[PDB]
Amino acid sequence: IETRKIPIPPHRMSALKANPLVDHCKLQVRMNIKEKRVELRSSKYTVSNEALQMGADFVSAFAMGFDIDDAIALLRLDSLYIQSFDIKDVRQTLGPDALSRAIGRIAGKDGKTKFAIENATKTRIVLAGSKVHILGAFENIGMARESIVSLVLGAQPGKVYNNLRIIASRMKERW
RNA sequence: AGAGGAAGUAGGUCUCCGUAGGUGAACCUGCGGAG
């Protein structure tokens, strides 16, 4: 018998107050969004450390900016990963014109560039300033990560999107 | 002004917060900030 408690940011508290993991994995839950904690407890119907760690990963992935439409995908498919890239990781210049210009390049007006990158490499990303979070299979996470870091190296989004599309097609192909 | 003669050229998304107005709890728009 093991328990795991996770902290949540003060962003998604109403969305966590929305309504089930006891039905999903037979693992008893408690919540308190004023101490920012969510208790996960394993019962006699709870069988595996896989179920424990996957419930923990599902709740933390809902906490870090994804909704349930992209979180029950993590509850369901075991090939699905999350990777959280800080924009402060590997940096091309020392100059502090970073945050606004970089996430203006990555996000794009009305979400055009983030959305086209998502549709191109089949991954699902969310963007909040310094931290950008990628969800999907880890080769798609590698594709989205190399596209985003080539966006912050200062390459144009048209050329980056073209190369991303051709790499995504060659990765979809079997032989 | 005249019929002839002869010639030549052809780039801030999402979420939250503080605002100000709107039709009020909520909610919408605009702005200023943090993730």
Coordinates of C-alpha atoms (C1' of nucleotides) in Angstrom, one line a residue:
Chain A
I1 CA 0.0 0.0 0.0
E2 CA 1.5 3.3 -1.2
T3 CA 0.1 6.8 -1.6
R4 CA 1.3 9.7 -3.8
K5 CA 0.4 13.3 -3.3
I6 CA 0.8 15.9 -6.1
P7 CA 0.8 19.7 -6.0
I8 CA -1.3 21.7 -8.4
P9 CA -0.8 25.3 -9.6
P10 CA -3.5 27.9 -8.8
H11 CA -4.5 28.0 -12.4
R12 CA -6.6 24.9 -13.0
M13 CA -8.5 24.7 -9.7
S14 CA -12.0 25.1 -11.1
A15 CA -11.2 22.6 -13.9
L16 CA -10.1 20.2 -11.2
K17 CA -13.3 20.9 -9.3
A18 CA -15.0 19.6 -12.4
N19 CA -15.8 15.9 -12.2
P20 CA -13.7 9.7 -11.6
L21 CA -10.2 8.2 -11.2
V22 CA -11.8 5.9 -8.6
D23 CA -13.9 4.5 -11.5
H24 CA -10.9 4.5 -13.9
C25 CA -8.2 2.8 -11.9
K26 CA -10.0 1.8 -8.6
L27 CA -7.7 4.1 -6.7
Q28 CA -9.2 6.3 -4.0
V29 CA -8.6 10.1 -4.4
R30 CA -8.9 13.1 -2.2
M31 CA -8.5 16.8 -3.1
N32 CA -7.8 20.0 -1.4
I33 CA -7.1 23.0 -3.7
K34 CA -6.4 25.4 -0.8
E35 CA -3.3 23.5 0.3
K36 CA -2.8 22.8 -3.5
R37 CA -2.6 19.0 -2.9
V38 CA -4.2 16.0 -4.5
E39 CA -4.0 12.7 -2.5
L40 CA -3.8 9.4 -4.5
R41 CA -4.2 6.2 -2.3
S42 CA -4.0 2.6 -3.4
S43 CA -6.7 0.3 -2.1
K44 CA -7.2 -3.5 -2.2
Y45 CA -8.8 -3.1 -5.7
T46 CA -5.7 -1.1 -6.8
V47 CA -3.3 -3.7 -8.1
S48 CA -0.2 -2.2 -9.8
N49 CA 2.5 0.4 -9.5
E50 CA 1.8 1.0 -13.2
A51 CA -1.7 2.2 -12.3
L52 CA -0.3 4.3 -9.4
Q53 CA 2.3 6.1 -11.5
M54 CA 0.0 6.5 -14.5
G55 CA -2.7 8.1 -12.3
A56 CA 0.0 10.4 -10.9
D57 CA 1.2 11.3 -14.4
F58 CA -2.4 11.9 -15.6
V59 CA -3.1 14.3 -12.7
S60 CA 0.1 16.2 -13.1
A61 CA -0.4 16.4 -16.8
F62 CA -3.9 17.8 -16.2
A63 CA -2.3 20.2 -13.7
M64 CA 0.4 21.5 -16.1
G65 CA -2.0 23.0 -18.6
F66 CA -3.8 20.2 -20.5
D67 CA -7.5 19.4 -20.4
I68 CA -9.2 16.1 -20.0
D69 CA -9.6 15.6 -23.7
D70 CA -5.8 15.4 -23.9
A71 CA -5.5 13.8 -20.5
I72 CA -7.7 10.7 -20.8
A73 CA -5.4 10.0 -23.8
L74 CA -2.6 9.7 -21.2
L75 CA -4.9 7.6 -19.0
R76 CA -5.6 5.3 -22.0
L77 CA -2.5 4.9 -24.2
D78 CA 0.8 3.7 -22.5
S79 CA 3.0 4.9 -25.4
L80 CA 2.2 8.5 -24.7
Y81 CA 4.7 10.8 -23.0
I82 CA 5.0 14.4 -21.7
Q83 CA 8.1 16.5 -21.9
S84 CA 8.4 20.0 -20.5
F85 CA 11.0 22.2 -22.2
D86 CA 12.0 25.4 -20.6
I87 CA 12.7 28.2 -23.0
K88 CA 15.8 29.0 -20.8
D89 CA 17.3 25.8 -22.0
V90 CA 20.0 25.9 -24.6
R91 CA 20.2 29.6 -25.5
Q92 CA 21.7 31.2 -28.6
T93 CA 22.5 34.7 -27.2
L94 CA 23.0 36.2 -23.8
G95 CA 20.6 39.0 -24.5
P96 CA 17.3 39.4 -22.5
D97 CA 15.0 40.1 -25.4
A98 CA 14.1 36.5 -25.1
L99 CA 10.6 35.8 -23.7
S100 CA 8.3 38.0 -25.7
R101 CA 10.0 37.7 -29.1
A102 CA 10.6 33.9 -28.7
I103 CA 7.1 33.0 -27.7
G104 CA 5.8 35.4 -30.4
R105 CA 7.7 33.3 -32.9
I106 CA 6.6 30.0 -31.5
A107 CA 3.0 30.7 -30.7
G108 CA 2.0 32.9 -33.7
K109 CA -0.9 35.2 -33.9
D110 CA -4.2 33.4 -33.2
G111 CA -2.2 30.3 -32.5
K112 CA -1.4 29.7 -36.2
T113 CA 2.2 28.4 -35.8
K114 CA 1.7 26.3 -32.6
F115 CA -1.5 24.9 -34.2
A116 CA 0.2 24.1 -37.5
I117 CA 3.1 22.4 -35.7
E118 CA 0.6 20.4 -33.7
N119 CA -1.3 19.3 -36.8
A120 CA 2.0 18.6 -38.6
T121 CA 3.7 16.3 -36.1
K122 CA 0.6 14.8 -34.4
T123 CA 1.6 16.1 -31.0
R124 CA -0.2 18.4 -28.6
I125 CA 1.6 21.3 -27.0
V126 CA 0.7 24.1 -24.6
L127 CA 2.6 27.3 -24.2
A128 CA 2.9 29.4 -21.0
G129 CA 5.9 31.8 -21.2
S130 CA 9.1 30.1 -20.1
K131 CA 7.7 26.5 -20.0
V132 CA 6.4 24.9 -23.1
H133 CA 4.9 21.4 -22.7
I134 CA 4.7 18.7 -25.4
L135 CA 2.5 15.6 -25.3
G136 CA 2.6 12.6 -27.6
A137 CA 4.8 9.8 -28.7
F138 CA 8.5 10.5 -28.0
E139 CA 9.6 10.7 -31.6
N140 CA 6.8 13.3 -32.2
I141 CA 8.1 15.1 -29.1
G142 CA 11.6 15.0 -30.6
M143 CA 10.2 16.5 -33.9
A144 CA 8.2 19.2 -32.1
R145 CA 11.2 20.0 -29.9
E146 CA 13.7 20.3 -32.8
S147 CA 11.1 22.5 -34.6
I148 CA 10.7 24.8 -31.5
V149 CA 14.4 25.1 -30.8
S150 CA 15.0 25.9 -34.5
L151 CA 12.3 28.5 -34.1
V152 CA 14.2 30.1 -31.2
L153 CA 17.5 29.9 -33.0
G154 CA 16.0 32.4 -35.4
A155 CA 15.0 30.4 -38.4
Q156 CA 11.9 31.4 -40.3
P157 CA 8.6 29.5 -39.5
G158 CA 7.9 28.8 -43.1
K159 CA 11.2 27.0 -43.7
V160 CA 10.8 25.3 -40.3
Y161 CA 7.3 24.2 -41.0
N162 CA 8.3 22.8 -44.5
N163 CA 11.1 20.7 -43.0
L164 CA 8.8 19.6 -40.2
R165 CA 6.2 18.4 -42.7
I166 CA 8.6 16.4 -44.7
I167 CA 10.3 14.8 -41.6
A168 CA 6.8 14.0 -40.3
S169 CA 5.8 12.2 -43.5
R170 CA 9.1 10.2 -43.6
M171 CA 8.5 9.2 -40.0
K172 CA 4.9 8.1 -40.7
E173 CA 6.1 5.9 -43.5
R174 CA 6.9 2.2 -42.7
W175 CA 9.3 1.2 -45.4
Chain B
rA1 C1' -0.8 76.6 -102.3
rG2 C1' -0.2 71.6 -107.3
rA3 C1' -1.0 67.2 -110.8
rG4 C1' 3.6 64.9 -112.5
rG5 C1' 9.3 63.4 -112.8
rA6 C1' 13.3 61.0 -110.2
rA7 C1' 15.1 58.7 -105.4
rG8 C1' 15.8 56.5 -100.5
rU9 C1' 14.3 54.2 -96.1
rA10 C1' 10.5 50.4 -93.6
rG11 C1' 4.2 37.2 -35.8
rG12 C1' 2.1 36.7 -27.7
rU13 C1' -1.5 31.2 -28.3
rC14 C1' -3.7 29.2 -23.6
rU15 C1' -4.9 30.0 -18.3
rC16 C1' -5.2 33.2 -14.2
rC17 C1' -5.0 37.9 -11.7
rG18 C1' -5.8 43.6 -11.1
rU19 C1' -8.5 47.1 -13.9
rA20 C1' -12.4 50.3 -17.0
rG21 C1' -17.1 50.0 -19.6
rG22 C1' -21.2 46.9 -21.2
rU23 C1' -27.0 44.0 -19.0
rG24 C1' -26.8 42.4 -14.4
rA25 C1' -24.0 36.6 -10.0
rA26 C1' -21.7 34.8 -13.9
rC27 C1' -20.4 36.6 -18.6
rC28 C1' -18.4 39.9 -23.0
rU29 C1' -14.9 43.5 -24.9
rG30 C1' -10.4 46.7 -24.2
rC31 C1' -5.8 47.3 -21.4
rG32 C1' -1.8 46.4 -17.6
rG33 C1' 0.8 42.3 -15.3
rA34 C1' 2.4 37.3 -14.0
rG35 C1' 2.8 32.0 -15.4

